[PDB]
């Protein structure tokens, strides 16, 4: 399945429809890709084939 989510996911009791920061976070987080990191923190480009 393919999911494109832009709203704020709620992780408490208050409705986090458009408010985030106190108990709810943005579901999308960018990758940390530094060339000075180790081998296990390098961007590997992967393709599928079924």
């Amino acid at each position, epitope marked *: 399945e393919r999911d494109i989510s832009t709203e704020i996911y709620q992780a408490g009791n208050k409705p986090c429809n*458009g*408010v985030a*920061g106190v108990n709810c976070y*943005f579901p999308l987080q*960018s990758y940390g890709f530094r060339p000075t990191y180790g081998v296990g923190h390098q961007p590997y480009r992967v393709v599928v084939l079924s």
Partner: antibody, heavy 126, light 109 residues
Framework: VQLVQSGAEVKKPGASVKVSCKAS????????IHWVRQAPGQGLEWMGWISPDSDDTNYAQSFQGRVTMTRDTSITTVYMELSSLRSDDTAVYFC????????????????????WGQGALVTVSS | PVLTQPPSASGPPGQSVSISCSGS????????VYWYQQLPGAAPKLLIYKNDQRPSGVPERFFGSKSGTSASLAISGLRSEDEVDYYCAAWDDSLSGHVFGAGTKVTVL
């Protein structure tokens, strides 16, 4: 690092200014240049950002064809054409060296402008 | 549109001065808000990024926070270099463009 550029004097409206924020002191393959003018008194008006690898540029929803950004590789500068200048946006232009490279419109959440070069006083009147 | 800021949130030295950065529903509340520093008649610079940490060379005394609809920046103590301007910047999905502050000037008493 430094972001030195040329300076344009006052001119009659109905022309095109030309400045070039030179990318010096760093390799120009991993940064982006964001353009914003600082009007005296009121707030800031942000234009857009460019891409080194490509002209992949995003424009603001207020100005579309009145401002155009193009780049070059050997000289490693940026060229602007500001057609149809008006006498209501007399402001100085800043180029900022921001970390992070993105091409999508849903990227602006984790990058910021580190170093701001000195501006080129540009203003509109006859 | 533009963010809402007080015109001049001044404060006498010897205590703390608080400045607010209130925007809209989609402006501040779902995206991380920023704070910038500008010298009078000079190029601006970053002041807080990501509302929790500061770059090198920035004093530890300076601190910022967020609530859900507005941003708060807390400073304490004013000197001859503390009359500089403070701007607050944010971003939104509705306009797809960076929106800065309105301009706040602080002076000693």
């Amino acid at each position: 690092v430094q972001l030195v550029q040329s300076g344009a004097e006052v001119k009659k409206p109905g022309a095109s200014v030309k400045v070039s924020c030179k990318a010096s002191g760093y390799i120009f393959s991993d940064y982006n240049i964001h353009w914003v003018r600082q009007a005296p008194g009121q707030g800031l008006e942000w234009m857009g950002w460019i891409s080194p690898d490509s002209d992949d540029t995003n424009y603001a929803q207020s100005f579309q064809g009145r401002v155009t950004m193009t780049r070059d590789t050997s000289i490693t500068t940026v060229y602007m054409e500001l057609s149809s200048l008006r006498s209501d946006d007399t402001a100085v232009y800043f180029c900022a060296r921001s970390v992070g490279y993105c091409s999508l419109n849903s990227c602006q959440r984790w990058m910021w402008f580190d170093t701001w070069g000195q501006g080129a006083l540009v203003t509109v009147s006859s | 549109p533009v963010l809402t800021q007080p015109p001049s949130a001044s404060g006498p030295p010897g205590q703390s001065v608080s400045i607010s950065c209130s925007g809209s529903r989609s402006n501040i509340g779902t995206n991380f808000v920023y704070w910038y520093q500008q010298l009078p008649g000079a190029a601006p610079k970053l002041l807080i990024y990501k509302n929790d940490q500061r770059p090198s060379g920035v004093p530890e005394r300076f601190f910022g926070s967020k609530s859900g609809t507005s941003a708060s920046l807390a400073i304490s103590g004013l000197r001859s270099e503390d009359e500089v301007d403070y701007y607050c910047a944010a971003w939104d999905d509705s306009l797809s463009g960076h929106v800065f502050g309105a301009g706040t000037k602080v002076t000693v008493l």
